[PDB]
Design a protein around this ligand. Structure first.
Ligand SMILES: [Mg+2]
Ligand SMILES: [Mg+2]
Ligand SMILES: [Mg+2]
Ligand SMILES: [Mg+2]
Ligand SMILES: [Mg+2]
Ligand SMILES: [Mg+2]
Ligand SMILES: [Mg+2]
Ligand SMILES: [Mg+2]
Ligand SMILES: [Mg+2]
Ligand SMILES: [Mg+2]
Ligand SMILES: [Mg+2]
Ligand SMILES: [Mg+2]
Ligand SMILES: [Mg+2]
Ligand SMILES: [Mg+2]
Ligand SMILES: [Mg+2]
Ligand SMILES: [Mg+2]
Ligand SMILES: [Mg+2]
Lengths: 190, 48, 87, 110, 42, 55
RNA sequence: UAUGCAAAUAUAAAAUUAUAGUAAUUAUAAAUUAUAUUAAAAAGGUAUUGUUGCCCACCAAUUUUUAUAAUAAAAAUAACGUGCAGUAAUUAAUAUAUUUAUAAAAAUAUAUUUUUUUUUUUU
RNA sequence: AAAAUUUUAGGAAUAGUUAAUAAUAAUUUAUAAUUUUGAUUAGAUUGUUUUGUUAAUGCUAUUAGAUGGGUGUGGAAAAAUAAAAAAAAUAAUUAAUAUAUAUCAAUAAUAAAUUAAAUUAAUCUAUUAGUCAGAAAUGGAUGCCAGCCGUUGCGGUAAUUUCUAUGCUUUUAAAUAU
């Protein structure tokens, strides 16, 4: 009985009246980190592990938990979570495939506040309507290819500027000026 | 005589504070709150 | 609480060690004398570590392994571990 | 700037101390900074950061076999072409060419 | 102490401490928010 | 705060917690929170003529 | 003495030191300290019965951790030998910058008082 | 078939590789895919009703169990010791007892001291600490030594702080270490 003191205990086999039957897991173990590597040479390029690493997911402090309540569930009644998503079309390099960036929500109960994260999806548009920078509605469906479970259900907002831009033979959107960041210094002149 | 100069009194109609008092003496932050009984450090307790 | 002094207990309350050397060291002023320091060895995950600890114990007939416990601070700077009994 | 302004925390005084540092503390840390800098000068340190290379990792040129000060310690292993170019850089840094901007010179730079 | 923890000038009203706790993890577990995806207690 | 997580000091724990803080999260404005300085002055000498297909 | 290069006190932080394993802390400001030309009256202390007070680096041994740069780094430390760097302290100190070097440190260029003050409302 | 939640103080690229065609292609077609909104390698780690502390948003635990294919059986690979699941006639239920082994659990100093056990009398013979500050001291040594040290600190022939002897102190599941 977890509500009884150290000295008050008689039998360890049963709860006499009611309450919760509780196993004590020993939380304070003084667990330690073993140091197997020199501070100079650690066998990873991007990150180094010098201390005890916190583990689990949802057991992870500060807790970050799935938030069903956001814009997407606000507008839709979803049969299954993530069955509907609203997003923007980012890039079409693949035939009958629209990549879509979408936002979802995370809740930190410690600070009592929400964050928006973002995630990319492959959606299947047969007939190739979607131009980069469309606002689209997207649904869960039959497995189509290795990574496509989603199809374009409706175009909410098409890109009129982008379409007229295509009609003239130009790319839908200008290609981004710089790519991913580097740790080098590129000296390229003229 | 310095203690009799500073004498305070308390209205006991209510027998204990009815709201929290949050107040600091020099560098010492004190909380005086309503309780079911008297709970405090031994010294603070027989002061109260 | 100072948690880095316990480095060689490795999350344990007591340790088992083997005797190697016993030398003497002089404490931080204004404390004069000779503090007896035993230089001990033990192994963990097939690594052999040399532990250095304060000898407060009672030695009888010749014996080898001791039991190490961590304390508070002592006169002698740099020696964290203390001796419980000798086996 | 690349190098460190300070070494250790030079402003430690009580809160609302109405200066960045006290005289005492700043003197202690001035001592430590002094020792480190003097070490850099006498051992003749040289560092380099090369374009199209990871920058945070700086080739230490003062340890290179040609420019190494010690006669004993094994210096470092740097690419033959790159090391030749580093040697040439260190060498042709030394003296003032007219029309070029005057840059501070020292014994320990050679 | 420029190098050290920030201290409150006075205490915090305990009542407010209890009012800001409404949506905390325990209350959520009681509301049933987290999905039970594993065996849990036996 | 358990002492085994992160560094041997306490404040290392709160320095890695600032990595998870809700209002501190990475977005289109605040980027490269963890290494800002490796990417600094990286493109200074990289000369890129901007993209114009329209007059 | 601002045509190359050069982010950087104006503060978002969780006890001091320490490259984030070393020692057990550190830092701090108003008590006290006899001579600055008023018809005798304004003054500073890293000491704490207080200058015969304290302290600073190099220069040996050793102890211990490691990210081994003339001669690795850092921390404990009670020898020997140089001096006299600091306490407005025998050319005031403090921070950055550049140079210099038995060792504290010293020279110069800027900011500045955790340095002591000297004061023309059109002559 | 998917969606959410995913760790390392000081952070760079990853790759039988994306999407369309189709029961195609070790050389089909294409301006492909993952990454700084932190990837892939690499360390540590058994993932989303289990604990401890707490007045409380917190902090701090939770085991264990799914490790590729290669005549592919089978409804389903979960298929090479390690039960405590009655397994095609009611084996048996007067049974819960299992002797001396193990693994990781499972909190036993159970009126710890005076009037006796509405028994079936079976297991056990059971103790520590302090003694400057702060409940409790005197002899005797020792002389900056030996030693004490939770902590300020103690030890310089008178030590209420060391050692020893004897008393004396405790609010009685022990001190000590983590
Ligand atoms: Mg530990
Ligand atoms: Mg002590
Ligand atoms: Mg200087
Ligand atoms: Mg000129
Ligand atoms: Mg060593
Ligand atoms: Mg050294
Ligand atoms: Mg002097
Ligand atoms: Mg001077
Ligand atoms: Mg002077
Ligand atoms: Mg100066
Ligand atoms: Mg000099
Ligand atoms: Mg100087
Ligand atoms: Mg096989
Ligand atoms: Mg007493
Ligand atoms: Mg004793
Ligand atoms: Mg005697
Ligand atoms: Mg006595």
């Amino acid at each position: 009985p977890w509500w009884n003191f150290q000295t008050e205990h008689r039998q360890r086999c049963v709860l006499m009246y009611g309450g919760a039957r509780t196993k004590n897991t020993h939380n304070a173990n003084h667990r330690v980190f073993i140091k197997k590597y020199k501070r100079n040479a650690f066998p990873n390029r991007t990150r180094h592990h010098w201390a005890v690493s916190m583990t689990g997911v949802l057991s992870q402090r500060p807790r970050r938990m799935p938030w069903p309540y956001d814009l997407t569930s606000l507008i839709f009644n979803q049969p299954r979570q993530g069955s509907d998503k609203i997003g923007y079309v980012v890039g079409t390099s693949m035939l009958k495939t629209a990549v879509v960036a979408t936002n979802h929500m995370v809740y930190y109960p410690k600070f009592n506040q929400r964050v928006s994260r973002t995630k990319r999806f492959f959606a299947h548009d047969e007939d190739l309507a979607c131009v980069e920078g469309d606002l689209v509605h997207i649904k869960q469906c039959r497995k189509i290819s290795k990574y496509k479970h989603y199809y374009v259900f409706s175009i909410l907002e098409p890109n009129v500027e982008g379409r007229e831009r295509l009609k003239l033979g130009l790319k839908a959107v200008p290609p981004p000026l710089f790519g991913y960041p580097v740790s080098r210094r590129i000296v390229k002149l003229n | 005589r310095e203690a009799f100069s500073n004498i305070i009194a308390v209205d006991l109609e209510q027998e204990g504070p009815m709201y929290p008092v949050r107040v600091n003496a020099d560098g010492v932050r004190v909380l005086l709150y309503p309780a079911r009984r008297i709970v405090a450090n031994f010294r603070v307790a027989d002061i109260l | 609480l100072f948690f880095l002094r316990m480095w060689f207990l490795y999350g344990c309350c007591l340790r088992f060690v083997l005797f190697v050397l016993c030398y003497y060291m002089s404490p931080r002023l204004p404390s004069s004398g000779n503090r007896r320091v035993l230089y001990a060895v033990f192994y963990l995950y097939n690594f052999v570590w040399m532990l250095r600890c304060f000898f407060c114990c009672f030695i009888g007939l010749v014996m080898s392994l001791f039991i190490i416990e961590g304390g508070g601070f002592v006169d002698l700077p740099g020696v964290k571990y203390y001796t419980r009994i000798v086996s | 700037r690349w190098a460190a302004k300070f070494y250790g925390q030079v402003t430690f005084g009580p809160r609302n101390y109405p200066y960045p540092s006290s005289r005492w503390l700043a003197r202690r840390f001035q001592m430590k900074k002094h020792r480190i800098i003097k070490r850099f000068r006498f051992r003749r340190y040289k560092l380099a950061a090369v374009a199209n290379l990871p920058f945070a990792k700086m080739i230490r040129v003062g340890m290179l076999p040609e420019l190494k000060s010690s006669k004993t310690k094994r210096g470092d292993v740097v690419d033959p072409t790159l090391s030749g170019q580093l040697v040439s850089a260190v060498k042709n840094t030394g003296e003032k060419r007219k029309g070029q901007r005057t840059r501070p010179k020292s014994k320990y730079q050679v | 102490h420029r190098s050290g923890k920030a201290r409150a000038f006075v205490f915090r009203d305990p009542s407010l401490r209890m009012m800001r706790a409404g949506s905390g993890y325990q209350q959520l577990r009681r509301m049933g928010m987290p999905m039970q995806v594993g065996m849990g207690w036996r | 705060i358990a002492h085994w997580y992160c560094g041997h000091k306490f404040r290392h724990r709160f320095m890695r917690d600032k990595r998870f803080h809700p209002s501190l999260q990475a977005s289109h404005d605040a980027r490269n929170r963890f290494s800002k300085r490796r990417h600094f002055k990286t493109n200074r000498w990289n000369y890129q003529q901007a993209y114009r297909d329209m007059p």
